[PDB]
Design a protein around this ligand. Structure first.
Ligand SMILES: Cc1cc2nc3c(=O)[nH]c(=O)nc-3n(C[C@H](O)[C@H](O)[C@H](O)COP(=O)(O)O)c2cc1C
Ligand SMILES: Cc1cc2nc3c(=O)[nH]c(=O)nc-3n(C[C@H](O)[C@H](O)[C@H](O)COP(=O)(O)O)c2cc1C
Lengths: 351, 351
């Protein structure tokens, strides 16, 4: 099996001739001890690199490049798993600095490579990094046929969020939404989870089938990070009255490409999604900042201090579902805030 | 003012060197009469084109280029708002056929330009067409500061989707959703709307502030299209029992780059978003496919047969708002389907 890695990279520090040449030197040298090949390119503070060789050798090389101080946003563009005949056998790493040389046919292609990457950097921010990992794994996400997979759906939102949008100016509101979103996304990803949607102030994420505990943990930390943010903010910041509401549900969902021909997403779709959505909806009524289904509770390895709440039902297998929260110091501090939903408005009046 | 335009197009039908010569010949001569300049390129069924000249003139040229049969997936990667000096003044439309020329420098450049567009085509699918429209105007989306807009928020979902998921296979479930999403996206964009989000089987979209009347019309047109779909689908097709509920709301919104730093989107936020989303849910209870807020009714020009429905609220500001619908041949046909939605599972079992 022969691999083919292609990627883009940004210059973290403005590199000069001596530094650029040094990168080109080591590359051709080390590749000879591993038989591996490829081509290096350069333009307006951007790197372009193709690589060919053995899967175990090639994967070790890419890992090393990710540690360099002058490298930021190392995005793999294509990864061919099985290759019969290498497209670059006569070379090792023939560096091509287009920043220096200017010809006739190259001049238009130069502008092209600048605008193409520029645009590719703009899309990168608006695309779900879940698809980028798929490309890097060596698969076209559009080619993925939908599958039946059991998962834990996470659904959260900002408590009495409408009062922020009603009182505060448009700029102040979005910074608070984004703040919350960037917090919620961070904790979930690091816990091996995936944020897949947003709607107003809603966040919708998912974790593995067995990842019940990792999900419970993620919700507790979201509350935790918000507790610090409620106090540690200065007197005259809306971030003081920021509270979350979280819902979790386990079940079999359909994950794949779901949307119009124009725009789609590699997300989940199932009954569990709505089960979570509706459970979270109940956090303001149950006065518990965290709410989850009995299936989540049973799927847990750890023996958490679970609270049982007045069971309610909707769709599914027609049968009723049991609602559970967790009795913790963090939950107690956050579950009381749902009855402070009228004391938050008093604060937002002054600002 | 002067304008520069860079875009990526796809080869519709297989074209040979002789047909590519014509594209170059006709363009360059028209360019000299226009005064405008540029470069055209060829690759693995991909076009690349820079175009520089007077604003109106360039637009009138791009307009014809947007109507040529040889094209597909035409996305202008960049649009330079006000240009001071052009970058190809000595050559008007100098074509470059990379399929015919094989050189030392250009061979690895070709593979790179190909993979950059290949990966760019995939990112294009997972992105809001709004950001692509934003780019074409000139400005960058990631640099748009949030603003106070007044807009009609549309919200819709598949009626008794819960039953479709359980009975039909994964491949089949997914298609029904997408099929529904295309129907909504088509008719929404046509009437001036912008589908901003998907969430499981929900569609969030928005029409402009004064375009309330058109926003109502699209909702009617969506039901109308689904009627046709149901009436004409063969035996065994789930499209026979495919119903939709629609919730509209008018009022101020906060448009902007909402999300994390790992993933963001240019969408809506505010009061209206939630109102609209709540009214769509109420359609299942109030058994009326089309449902809208009090503000939508007051902003309507044409005299529709407005049916008043049971006034209520959830969260909001504890205040109840007048909830309406329409008494039309289509509304009355689709509204009933919500009451008989309780026994649509029988047909879905039959497959
Ligand atoms: C753009 C770029 C390309 C590189 N290409 C290669 C390469 O082809 N082979 C290689 O072994 N290292 C390559 N490197 C990584 C260098 O070897 C690395 O900077 C460093 O010298 C590794 O430290 P070491 O000698 O302690 O392992 C590249 C680095 C950069 C910035
Ligand atoms: C890839 C491509 C690029 C084109 N570029 C130009 C151009 O720069 N200028 C132009 O006038 N026509 C260009 N055309 C041709 C137009 O699509 C169209 O045929 C022309 O504007 C109308 O020509 P006519 O009035 O002689 O029929 C291009 C076509 C293709 C397929």
């Amino acid at each position: 099996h022969m691999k083919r890695l292609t990627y883009i990279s940004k210059f973290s520090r403005p590199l000069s001739g001596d530094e650029i040449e040094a990168i080109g030197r080591i590359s051709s040298q080390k590749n000879q001890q591993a038989n591996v090949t490829g081509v290096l390119l350069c333009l307006d503070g951007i790197f372009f690199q193709i690589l060919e060789g053995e899967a175990e050798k090639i994967d070790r090389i890419y890992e090393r490049i990710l540690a360099d101080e002058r490298h930021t946003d190392i995005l793999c563009l294509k990864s061919e798993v099985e290759v019969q005949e290498r497209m670059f056998p006569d070379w090792s790493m023939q560096t091509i600095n287009l920043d220096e040389n200017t010809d006739f046919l190259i001049r238009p292609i130069k502008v092209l490579l600048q605008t193409l990457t520029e645009s590719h950097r703009i899309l990168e921010k608006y695309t779900q990094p879940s698809i980028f990992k798929i490309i890097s794994q060596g698969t076209n996400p559009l080619n993925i046929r939908p599958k039946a997979v059991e998962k834990i759906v996470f659904f959260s939102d900002i408590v009495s969020f409408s009062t922020f949008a009603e009182k505060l100016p448009v700029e102040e509101v979005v910074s608070v939404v984004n703040s919350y979103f960037s917090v919620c996304t961070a904790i979930i990803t690091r816990q091996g989870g995936e944020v897949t949607k947003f709607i107003g102030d809603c966040v919708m994420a998912y974790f593995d089938g067995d990842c019940a505990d990792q999900a419970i943990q993620a919700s507790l930390d979201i509350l935790m990070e918000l507790e610090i943010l409620r106090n540690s903010a200065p007197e005259g910041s809306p971030l003081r009255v920021l509270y979350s509401g979280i819902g979790l549900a386990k079940g079999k969902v359909i994950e794949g490409n779901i949307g119009s021909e124009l725009k789609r997403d590699y997300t989940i779709l199932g009954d569990a999604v709505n089960v979570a959505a509706r459970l979270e909806a109940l956090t303001r009524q149950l006065s518990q900042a965290l709410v989850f289904s009995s299936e989540v509770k049973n799927s847990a390895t750890k023996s958490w201090n679970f609270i049982w709440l007045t069971d309610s039902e909707l769709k599914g297998k027609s049968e009723s579902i049991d609602i559970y929260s967790i009795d913790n110091e963090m939950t107690r501090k956050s579950s009381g805030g749902l009855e402070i939903a009228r004391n938050i408005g008093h604060y937002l009046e002054r600002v």
